[PDB]
Design a protein around this nucleic acid. Structure first.
Lengths: 115, 69, 177
RNA sequence: GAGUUGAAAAUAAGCAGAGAUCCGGAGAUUCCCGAAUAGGUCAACCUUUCGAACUUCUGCUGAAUCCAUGGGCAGGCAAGAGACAACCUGGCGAACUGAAACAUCUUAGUAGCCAGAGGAAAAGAAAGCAAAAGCGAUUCCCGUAGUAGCGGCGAGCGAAAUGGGAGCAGCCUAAACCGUGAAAACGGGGUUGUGGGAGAGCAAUACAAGCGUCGUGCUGCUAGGCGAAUCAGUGGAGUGCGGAACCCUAGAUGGUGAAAGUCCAGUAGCCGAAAGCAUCACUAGCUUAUGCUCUGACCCGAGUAGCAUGGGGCACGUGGAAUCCCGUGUGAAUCAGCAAGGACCACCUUGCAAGGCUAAAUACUCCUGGGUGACCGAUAGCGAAGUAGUACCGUGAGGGAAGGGUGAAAAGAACCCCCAUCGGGGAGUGAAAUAGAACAUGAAACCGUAAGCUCUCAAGCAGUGGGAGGGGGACCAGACCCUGACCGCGUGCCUGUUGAAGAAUGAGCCGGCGACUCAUAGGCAGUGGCUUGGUUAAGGGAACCCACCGGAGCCGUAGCGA
RNA sequence: GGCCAGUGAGACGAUGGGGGAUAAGCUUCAUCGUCGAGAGGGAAACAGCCCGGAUCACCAGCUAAGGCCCCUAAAUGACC
RNA sequence: CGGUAGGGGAGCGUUCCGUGUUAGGGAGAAACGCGUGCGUGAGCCGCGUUGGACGAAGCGGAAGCGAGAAUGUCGGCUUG
């Protein structure tokens, strides 16, 4: 009742096709194709949570570098002082996006934070 | 085919009592009886239930005797 | 019903769990036997009733009494039949009660001993309908029930023992009124 | 009834419609070795007075020894030797193991070794079971029953009787008695059991059955024979598809370029044996043979049973240890008796040891002939799909591989060129030549070549998130795929540990093979079927499964106590 | 209770002690926390220390422990 | 709604079998390779100038049923 099969080769060929552009025996050699599928997926996990964290960090330092161009000592903390006292609910650090896509509009943002 | 064999060394020690519970004779009776008390010698003269641990151990080691639980 | 559309009910046939076919299946790897020991190794393993070198459960307990002596165990010598087996039966007012009546009616189904233990009628339960019993001997309370019902009661002498002629002579000498 | 001289083509000669080749029955030959056999032998050879040597049978002559015995000579189609996978019987007969050690025990009277023998063998016709009721040789199956027991009462071992089926079959011999002979024998009689037989006397005749070279009988087998019913179109080929018809007592199977009720071989059915074998039924014939009365004399298997010991085996390990068989030694009775009924005694019941032979049910496959397969498909299935127990290894015992598939048909490439070949390119065959003899689908590791992007100030389990620059096709042109300037982050996988990136283990890589499975039981859970309680086992069955029987048994109905 | 598993080598940290030399990431106990079986953040890295308990997605916001010169997110913030 | 040893529930796949001489298939089945598709995933479905004859689904059953480990093992091919 012999049971020679082919399902390991489709099982294995799917993982073989996912492991393209892995520079060498991480892209050809099955017994490393498995663990590069595995380590590639957990790399996708931690780099996804830390792409949320990392783009948060990037917008913080980008709008900090935008506000510090005034010359007078107005930090990023004081922009949030007078960004929540003057009631602006949650611009979500997308003013770090229109701070470079619309620099006159972020000058209107900050020049209305002053008043 | 192969029938299971009743373990004779425990069939001579354990017994079912109609409702289906293993009873047993207490130990320490056929040896050094003057040294004990009559209170002990009629405490150790009665047949009691076996406790649940060795009520579920020998229930599969003595298969043909109709014990529930 | 066609050959196509037949299917068992759910819960009737579970799938047998296969062991060592993946850790997502449930019992992969060591197949559900821990790490090491006699429980994981292949073979007969452990005798059931063995306490690991300790003197076991059965050896520390003294033997049951007649089984300790090798005396022949207590054995039923009759068929115990209550009157509750007789009222619930469909025996009407005119009916004989014997071995083949209780076999052919559906009360007793004796198979292992058709030859040795005849019958006995016991006391618990009532018997209002009168009958004509020619069976084997009775208890005192069942004799009170059956004679309290006004039914024909007849004991049946089964077998006659062989008495030696000097024992039959010594017993026949004892007839001194 | 039409072509043949094997695979296995070619060539040379034949043999054959007064019937070849081939098939079947019965015969003939069968060199040499091997029981091997005239003698030797280092098997397939040597020497030979050419021989079945030796044992057994028959016959003659007949030593020490008179009869004998031994020997010698001779005859003999002449009985045995040797081989045989498994089952069977008989004898020697373990140990690893289990008991969580180990010696009693178990494994186990199993394996192995030797001997023997048949399709079966052993056993087998009551000196038996049983229990006051009864059965009637042995064997096997279901059951009792994992019960009674046995056992460092440990591990374990484990009946038997009652019951239900398969299959049935019972017969010869010794003794007492007559007759012949110095016994030893021979011929008649008798072989049985709620007793017979011998001795004496009275009756009485034929019913039934058993055995069997011999040949007419029957069916079956070993060769075979007749045997129904369609074309056309389709991309190589049609049996598939679409259109038109038919057979069926035949639609099982195998093949045919491709899958077939109608193409072939066949099948269903009907037939057929000179010769041999087998099945039961005839036959010249041999045989079995009968009943009563009296009679305790005479007989009913002797170095035997029993006993004292030493044991073995019955499930029973020496225990109260019976039954059965042996070693040493003692050593009975005949029926008014003896043996058994689990020490033993008394009574009763049962049977008649010390003499043999028997078919069936039954177990197995080196096989043979049919039919099958939720069996395999070239690492599988037999070790073996070719030289397979082969090549090869070992002195030897012994160990032991691997290698399948071009096409439908070799139609296997005429001829030209390179050229010493091997090979290659045209051409030709083919549906396919990228199906070319390393030849069918051809995947991964591995080795390459071409195209796009990109690396030579760079530290990295080689990824991933973001994405500079660039390339490609595009249609939902914002999308998709490929490359990757640079930044952040990220201590291979398994095993297994308190703790593994670990400098603990494992793996060179790729692909296959490779592990909680099977039988029978106990327990529980889930789904059912009946609850006028449930359910059958063995066994019977249109080959198997199966409808339907088959109530034996099992479980639950009553417990307590040793 | 029924059926049915593993586990029975623990480790460190605080307290209570014994052995030691109040020496050990030492040994043995008693209560507790973590790891084991726990990811993330802080601890430069780093099982057991602090915050904290990961179903998953978001190029969302507010915080705990801890930090706000640069590498590296946020104060070269204010006053003693 | 983290999870090791472990326990339970629900499913995918493979070859064979019933339906099955099934639907479909030299107008290209299985294979092998492919995806701008769908799933929690095991996987399904679809496309192939490769290949050439078998064989789905659904409703069910049975396993020599699923591979990355055994200094596994058998072939092929590397490194040096």
């Amino acid at each position: 009742r012999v049971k020679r099969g082919y399902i390991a080769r489709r099982r294995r060929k799917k993982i073989r096709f996912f492991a393209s552009s892995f520079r060498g025996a991480h892209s050809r050699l099955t017994r490393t194709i498995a663990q590069q599928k595995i380590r590639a997926l957990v790399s996708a996990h931690r780099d996804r949570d830390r792409q949320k964290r990392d783009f948060r960090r990037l917008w913080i330092t980008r709008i900090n570098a935008a506000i510090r161009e005034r010359g007078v000592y107005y930090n990023y903390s004081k922009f949030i002082h007078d960004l929540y006292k003057r009631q602006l609910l949650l611009n979500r650090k997308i003013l770090a996006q229109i701070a470079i896509l619309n620099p006159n509009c972020i000058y209107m943002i900050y020049n209305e934070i002053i008043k | 085919g192969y029938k299971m064999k009743t373990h004779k060394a425990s069939a001579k020690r354990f017994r079912v009592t109609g409702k289906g519970k293993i009873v047993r004779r207490r130990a320490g009776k056929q040896h050094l009886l003057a040294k004990k008390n009559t209170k002990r010698k009629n405490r150790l003269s009665k047949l009691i239930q076996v406790d649940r641990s060795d009520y579920d151990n020998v229930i599969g080691a003595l298969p043909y005797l109709k014990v529930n639980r | 019903f066609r050959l196509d559309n037949l299917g068992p009910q759910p819960g009737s046939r579970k799938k047998g769990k296969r062991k060592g076919r993946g850790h997502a299946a449930g019992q992969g790897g060591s197949c559900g036997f821990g790490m090491r020991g006699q429980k994981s190794r292949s073979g007969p393993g452990i005798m059931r009733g063995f306490e690991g070198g300790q003197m076991p459960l059965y050896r520390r307990i003294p033997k049951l009494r007649g089984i300790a002596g090798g005396m022949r165990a207590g054995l039923p010598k009759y068929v115990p039949i209550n009157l509750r087996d007789i009222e619930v039966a469909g025996f009407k007012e005119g009916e004989e009660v014997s071995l083949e009546s209780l076999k052919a009616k559906g009360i007793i189904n004796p198979s292992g001993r058709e030859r040795r233990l005849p019958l006995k009628i016991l006391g618990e339960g009532e018997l209002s309908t009168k009958l004509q019993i020619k069976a084997r001997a009775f208890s005192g309370s069942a004799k009170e029930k059956l004679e309290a019902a006004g039914c024909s009661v007849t004991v049946l002498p089964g077998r006659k023992k062989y008495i030696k002629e000097s024992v039959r002579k010594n017993l026949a000498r004892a007839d001194e009124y």
